[PDB]
Design a protein around this motif. Structure first.
Motif, short mmCIF file in Angstrom:
data_model
loop_
_atom_site.label_atom_id
_atom_site.label_comp_id
_atom_site.label_asym_id
_atom_site.label_seq_id
_atom_site.Cartn_x
_atom_site.Cartn_y
_atom_site.Cartn_z
N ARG A 87 41.14 64.20 65.46
CA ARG A 87 40.33 64.85 64.41
C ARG A 87 41.12 65.95 63.70
O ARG A 87 41.11 66.04 62.47
CB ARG A 87 39.06 65.43 65.03
N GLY B 2 43.60 64.48 61.17
CA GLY B 2 42.88 64.09 59.93
C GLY B 2 42.53 65.31 59.07
O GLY B 2 42.79 65.34 57.87
N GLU C 237 45.59 66.87 57.34
CA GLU C 237 46.04 66.03 56.22
C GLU C 237 45.27 66.41 54.94
O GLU C 237 45.87 66.69 53.90
CB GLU C 237 45.76 64.56 56.56
N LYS D 33 43.09 54.44 63.56
CA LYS D 33 41.84 55.08 63.19
C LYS D 33 40.74 54.76 64.20
O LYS D 33 39.56 55.06 63.99
CB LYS D 33 41.40 54.63 61.79
#
Lengths: 450, 561, 37, 450, 145, 152, 145
Positions: free
Chosen positions: B444, B447, B450, D333
């Motif tokens: 997490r 992400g 980013e 993912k």
């Protein structure tokens, strides 16, 4: 015994002998030439023919031209009197003085002496440069490359270490071996003048190879230098510091002949043997048997095209105990020495620091400065993203710390900082950070040293 | 001319040899000068030999002799504390012929034995050496030495009325030592490093590649593992040495200590050097000599770690031999044969049920050194396809002073499910759930970082700032481990889970406090946080006390509101 | 937004670096196999 | 008839025969060896000499060593009793059971039987995986590759299909042929245990080739497997599903010998013959004469270096009727199975869907989900460019649909979804989109199924 | 043109087809010649050439791989057949590069001869836009014609 | 090619004491293109002051290589021996190069970048060197070569 | 060094010039050697090398170029001529990259040897700032000298 050329292609010459074949590595002499032309035997092809590599141009050679076998390779005229002299890549005088009077005549490939002990590098070498001595300490027996790029003052740093280096109270005498490869006439004249004027020459052997000297002489240069170092260290018990600039230029010459030798090229056009030839040079360092002397290396590795991933600089990293990486970007910001504080490391650093060596807080201070400088550099990116005013108070302190590290710790006004001086500057700049933000310094050190 | 031959020609690194009619393909041959070579090409009128050293020491007419071996190794008392090279020999013999060892009989005359059976014990070096019936030998023990002192060459036992057994034995490094079965990956190789043991587990008898550019810390992971991993014996193939990496280990490691006992680490190690002056042949054979020695120790019922510095340099030495043999170059000029060979090597890894029962294992950690960041061929590409584990040292993580510099986004291990039950039964019932939760945290964070790289961090909600806060604590307080600290150099399984629960408990409390409108700034400066940051340095369970210290402190934050 | 084009620009040139030069060590290796044979 | 080795270079051995030359493809046996050593004839060099490729190591061979011609290629001991057994790449027992008792002995290159009919693939194979059965239906006679990369669970998918596949009410019996190439000992032990424990072994023939088995044995593995499949399908009238992992590993072995065979290399170092050898494997599939049986292939194609343009995976695409492409990015993912919904295709999909096969709305739903997922994935890029808040309401729905497709349709908690179950999930997620935005679903289907 | 067939036959297949095509146009028919594909024909030809030891060039293809292919496409056209009457052979050739590279053999040499190119676009296909012909990358020199 | 043909029709040397001529050379063109170029020169009356060389795609590769040399020699003759200002239009140089490249392989050379002949620049130099004012300064040779981007 | 001249002659042109330059400095004259340019000399050399089948590297240039180019610039310098007296050869070499790329051949290798670089800047020129030398991108390692 005499032979006759049967084939010539650039630097590679085939030579047939009717009686006695010369063994691999022997130096052969071509007859009928105005200047001495050496052919080094590389292979036995079969049918009484050997394959050789020329040490100078082959223009004007004819098939059938005569060649004699000298009965030996090339070698080092070893003596303590090597100190105070300036020589070529091959060990011939460049200082208008007489040729060396050998005490022993040593092979230069690394086979002679078998000098190394199976002991770890240890104890201090004072370079007189704060960014090395304080934060990335050079240790006796270590290989600590200077990592740079074209346009950067790597040679100025190399020359300064040559002038300044010592082994502070050691019972052993100290010597420098300085070898330059593929340098201009202007650079050669400069290096000579520098050694002579400063009196650094008194404790140094200097080997200078010019850009227009034979490529084979350049290949032999680092081997002459390492053999002299091993002799002084092992037979005279000296702590010897060897400075080799530039390994990338050595590589350009070795690469230049690989093609003439018939090999299929490897990545980036390099010789397939890049890492096992380079290993013959980086293997030659460490404490010598008896533990009175040692051989330390400071090789210069310029990034071709500033690319630290080029196979040459990239394979050199494993041969080192300390690396100092210079960056063009940093140099363009006016930060000198242009050392990348997040890419310079001490592989064997922990073996040369702490109580009884430097000071007990050295590792903690080094860790905290490295962490704070890395955070500060990332925050320069964050400032660009969000604006200076949007940065938190805490981040602003780390941002400012990066400037303080560069202005005060990295920058030296040429100046020989003791490790005590370097730790003091380190603690002074650390005060800029909140004490609550010194995660990597135990409380014992904060109370005693902050 | 069956057992010996004479050099026809030499130059270009290949020696052509007349004779040697009985030599095997890939056998070591010996030149009169003392150099060794490998039989590469067998032709109708010659043998082509790769020379493992300088060919100027070879001349036409020189005598050449068979050794009869692809290669061999001696396996008996005298291995520990010993320093060898690519083909085992003091840094020449292998095992001292004069040294006396106290042999203790563990079998009586009349006993029936099979290869791998333990007939005696020798306290050569504590370690207790286990004397085994060589593989392929069985029958009845007709004679056996009494408890005394003997040299290696002496006969301690006879089987089937005459095979004679000693304390040592020989084995072709090229041939993986026999075993009953390669048990499925079940038991973790407790490293003591939180990031590894938690997120990228290595199983005992697993193959986990170590890959990344030069100077990223690949060797260091290996060395820390040896100083602290739960293997009794280590087999270090310190290959790709250069400049002084040879002397760097020559007189250095002989001083490195065993954190577990406080004795020299060499006392439980076998060194296999691969220097540049050594023939491509020797370095090529070095992994096979090591693996065979590794398989030998696991046969005793030991868990051994095989650390391979590195296979990039082994494939370069092999490409040199192949090109000299004129084999057709492919990608990057490497021979076609490499992928099957490299795989065959890693296949010899595994935890087995040794001959005569008992369990042992060989875990392999291989260094990956691509030509330069390209991370393609040889090394990386082929390796990352075999190995089950990859710990990616990240130069950017290193520059940022995040240690260990293992990228928690690019690293992987599969054995996670294979070893989870060992952890659940012996350490903690919530091991798997805890590491999955931490990894989701790190996932997490990746992400979020980013996105922040694009739109900046100013728009971040308190919920997202909390996740970065805890994500950062995981990286700094857990992933990072100090190999130089006397305590954090090794992190026992019991300590790893306890630190994990302190972090995960701080997470739950953090998210719970935010949900109740507690300022994140209030949590970020929570006093317990600084203690959680130094938890890796505590050698006492005072660490699990931090959970209660965390809860009450949050209550003091539920109080002030 | 000229942040986009900015550091992200570094982006396109490490990207481009990576291979008109890498793609070339290569058109030329294969030459090299039977270019050398 | 007997010959003598005249040359040995790695896997390539030349052998001279004084009487009777062995034809190309014949298996020759080397005399004087502890373990059987086969040489497969590859060429006739002239002068009564043939060029061969060894199926095991050539260390210890001597010039003059004797060789016999077996009179045939390597062969398959064909029998219905092949079912329930685990064998090596060469068809030798690995399960501690006796060697196969042949009903017929068949050549393995594809020449035997001439089994195929000139009819199109048709009818359903229920894999039990929703992302195949519902959206990319496997049909009897088709070649539908699994397209993956290193680190991805392609072998788990292959093993699951082997356990689960059936041909729902068919009058014909169903069988699986599972062939693994260049696998570890650990992987071999795992595959064996899986087939034995589940009882999948009862209706399967399994061929396992290890990484350390001879390269020639790996080359023969897919040919043993395809010959067994064609025998069961043609002579016993069975619908046979052949699972081949990994074609890339097969290619690494074939490539490995091309060099020893004297060929000039093609792109990326591969054999120049890459596509015409690979064609000998992908040509072997389809309905068999009589139309009682069929041979279907599910080859695994891992991307070397994750590059789907590498010549191996790229040439394999033409041999397939359905492709399932796995992506590392998607796997990272947490979306499993890690299928790229915009790079997985059903070449023959339209032949296995609609009224009387699946359901009348199947094509429309598949088209709409594919279009919406592709738009949603592009919008993930647009979000990164402009920010989430700047996205239109309509685009936000498509962005969200991509997450819904991944969370609910792609992801299965291991679970055998009927096509009805898969279409239901498809319609449920489609509700997230505005009804006015369902361009690819005729109004008749919206009214009946939405 | 199956894989078990010699490189020779597949090489000759376009010539056998074009001749049959020219034969029907001679009658006064408009015929379409669809060539699955020339990438595989050039691979069969490279196999024959390498076996004949002809010098390999780019991607190891023989030097005579451009003039030949052009000569093939030149036989296309609408003519006034022997004894008057009009007929024609229109050629549609498939292009299959080794893998997306879209260089040699097939594509490169072909796109230089042909006057029309209909670029099926995998991204247009994934987006369910049919026909999947990229209206930005496709071209014809016949618009005005 | 429309631009090249239009220049061929229209070009002149406005008040020059010297006569003006065009040399138009086409290389590796289709039969349809050849018929079109012919018809255009004949219909417009551009043909009266032009020499036209047409090489077809199916003509020998060697004839294509010789085409630009026939054209440049005619231009140099008209310019030097007749004192004319000559405009030479060469389409397409890329197609000339595809033919020269096609034979380099058959000639035994190791290929250079992109599969091209190693001699690409020193053959091409033999064509671009041939232009400029001629001795006497009554005439001149001018070139308008067409260079299509392969793959753009 | 015209285009109709062999790659050989243009390759030798800098050596013929430098020798003539060294000849005049021997008299005790200070001579300037202006080399239009070395980019074209390296292209002529690459043509000769490729024709000799030497292995192409970066941009298809032979490996041998860097050492050669350096050897050329090394012949520059102010000397004490034979029989005393001082003379010198100063070299000013033009740099023409394939097109703005400013990589290989010319620029890259040259800027690594030369001690001085005067960067004409097209933007400085368009702005009518003459000489158009960029005072931010130019450098001289002789300032202190």
């Amino acid at each position: 015994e005499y032979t006759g050329i049967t084939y010539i292609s650039g630097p590679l010459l085939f030579v047939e002998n009717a009686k006695d074949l010369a063994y691999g590595a022997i130096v052969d002499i071509k007859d009928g030439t105005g200047r001495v032309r050496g052919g080094q035997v590389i292979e036995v092809s079969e049918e009484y023919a050997v394959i050789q590599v020329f040490e100078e141009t082959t223009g004007l050679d004819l098939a059938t031209t005569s060649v004699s076998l000298v009965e030996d390779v090339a070698r080092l005229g070893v003596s303590k009197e090597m100190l105070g002299r300036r020589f070529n890549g091959i060990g011939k005088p460049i200082d208008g003085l007489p040729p060396i009077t050998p005490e022993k005549r040593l092979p230069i490939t690394g086979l002679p002496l078998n000098p190394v002990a199976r002991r770890k590098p240890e104890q201090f070498i004072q370079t007189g440069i704060s960014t090395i001595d304080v934060m990335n300490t050079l240790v006796r027996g270590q290989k600590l490359p200077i990592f740079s790029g074209s346009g950067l003052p790597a040679n100025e740093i190399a020359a300064q270490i040559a002038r300044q280096a010592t082994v502070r109270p050691k019972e052993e005498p100290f010597a420098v071996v300085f070898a330059a490869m593929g340098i201009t006439q202007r650079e050669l004249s400069y290096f000579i003048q520098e050694f002579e004027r400063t009196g650094a020459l008194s404790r140094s052997v200097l080997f200078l190879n010019k850009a227009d000297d034979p490529t084979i002489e350049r290949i032999l240069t680092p081997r002459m230098a390492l053999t002299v170092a091993e002799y002084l260290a092992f037979e005279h018990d000296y702590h010897v510091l060897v400075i080799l600039t530039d390994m990338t230029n050595y590589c350009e010459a070795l690469r230049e002949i690989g093609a003439a030798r018939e090999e299929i090229p490897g990545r980036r056009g390099y010789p397939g043997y890049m890492y096992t030839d380079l290993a013959t040079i980086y293997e030659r360092a460490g404490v010598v048997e008896g533990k009175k002397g040692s051989v330390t290396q400071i090789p210069i590795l310029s990034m071709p095209d500033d690319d630290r991933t080029h196979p040459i600089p990239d394979l050199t990293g494993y041969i080192t105990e300390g690396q100092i990486q210079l960056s063009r970007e940093l140099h363009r910001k006016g930060i000198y020495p242009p050392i990348d504080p997040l890419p310079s490391l001490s592989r064997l650093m922990n073996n040369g620091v702490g109580k009884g060596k430097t000071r007990e807080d050295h590792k903690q201070v080094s860790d905290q400065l490295y962490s704070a400088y890395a955070n500060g550099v990332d925050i320069r990116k964050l400032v660009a993203i969000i604006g200076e005013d949007a940065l938190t108070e805490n981040d602003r302190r780390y941002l400012q710390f990066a400037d303080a590290f560069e202005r005060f710790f990295i920058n030296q006004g040429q100046q020989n900082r003791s490790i005590e001086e370097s730790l003091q500057i380190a603690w002074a700049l650390l005060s800029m950070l909140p004490q609550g933000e010194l995660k990597r310094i135990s409380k014992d050190h904060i109370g005693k040293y902050y | 001319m069956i057992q010996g031959v004479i050099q026809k020609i030499a130059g270009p690194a290949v020696i052509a040899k007349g004779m040697l009619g009985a030599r095997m393909y890939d056998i070591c041959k010996v030149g009169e000068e003392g150099l060794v070579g490998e039989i590469i090409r067998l032709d109708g009128d010659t043998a082509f030999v790769q020379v493992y050293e300088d060919t100027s020491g070879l001349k036409v007419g020189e005598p050449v002799v068979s050794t009869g071996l692809p290669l061999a190794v001696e396996l008996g008392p005298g291995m520990l504390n010993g320093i060898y090279d690519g083909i085992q020999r003091p840094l020449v013999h292998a095992l001292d012929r004069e040294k006396k060892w106290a042999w203790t009989p563990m079998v009586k005359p009349g006993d029936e034995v099979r290869g791998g059976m333990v007939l005696g014990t020798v306290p050569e070096f504590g370690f207790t050496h286990k004397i085994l019936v060589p593989p392929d030998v069985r029958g009845r023990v007709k004679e056996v030495k009494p408890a005394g002192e003997y040299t290696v060459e002496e006969p301690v036992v006879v089987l089937e009325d005459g095979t004679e057994l000693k304390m040592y034995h020989t084995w072709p490094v090229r041939r993986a030592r026999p075993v009953q079965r390669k048990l499925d990956p079940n038991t973790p190789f407790l490293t003591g490093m939180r990031i590894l043991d938690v997120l990228f587990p290595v199983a005992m008898g697993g193959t986990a590649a170590i890959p990344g550019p030069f100077g990223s810390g690949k060797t260091v992971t290996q060395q820390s593992l040896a100083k602290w991993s739960n293997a009794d014996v280590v087999v270090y193939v310190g290959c790709g040495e250069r400049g002084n990496e040879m002397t760097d280990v020559l007189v250095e490691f002989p001083e490195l200590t065993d954190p577990k006992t406080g004795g020299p680490l060499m006392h439980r190690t076998v060194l296999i050097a691969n220097t540049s002056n050594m023939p491509v042949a020797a370095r090529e054979a070095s992994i096979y000599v090591g693996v065979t020695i590794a398989e030998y120790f696991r046969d005793q019922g030991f868990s051994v770690a095989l650390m391979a510095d590195s296979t990039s340099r082994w494939a370069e030495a092999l490409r040199e031999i192949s090109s000299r043999l004129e084999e057709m170059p492919a990608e990057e000029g490497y021979p076609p044969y490499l992928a099957a060979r490299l795989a065959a090597f890693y296949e010899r890894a595994g935890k087995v049920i040794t001959l005569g029962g008992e369990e042992g294992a060989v875990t392999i950690v291989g260094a990956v050194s691509p030509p330069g960041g390209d991370m393609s061929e040889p090394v990386t590409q082929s390796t990352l396809r075999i190995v089950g584990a990859f710990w990616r040292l990240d130069a950017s993580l290193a520059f940022r002073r995040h240690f260990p510099a293992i990228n928690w986004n690019g690293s992987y291990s599969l054995f996670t499910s294979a070893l989870d039950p060992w952890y659940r039964e012996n350490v903690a019932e919530d091991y798997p759930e805890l590491r999955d939760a931490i990894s989701e945290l790190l996932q997490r964070e990746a992400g979020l970082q980013e996105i922040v790289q694009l739109v900046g961090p100013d728009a971040l909600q308190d919920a997202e700032r909390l996740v970065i806060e805890v994500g950062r604590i995981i990286r700094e307080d857990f992933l990072q481990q100090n190999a130089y600290h006397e305590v954090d150099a090794y992190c026992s399984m019991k300590k790893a889970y306890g630190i994990m629960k302190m972090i995960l408990a701080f997470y739950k409390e953090a998210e719970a406090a935010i949900k109740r409108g507690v300022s994140i700034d209030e949590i970020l400066q929570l006093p317990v946080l600084e203690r959680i940051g130094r938890a890796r340095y505590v050698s006492e369970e005072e660490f699990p006390a931090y959970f209660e210290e965390a809860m009450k402190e949050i209550q003091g934050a539920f109080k002030a509101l | 937004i000229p942040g986009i084009r900015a550091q992200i620009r570094f982006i396109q040139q490490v990207l481009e670096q990576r291979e008109r030069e890498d793609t070339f060590r290569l058109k030329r290796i294969k030459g090299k196999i039977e270019a050398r044979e």
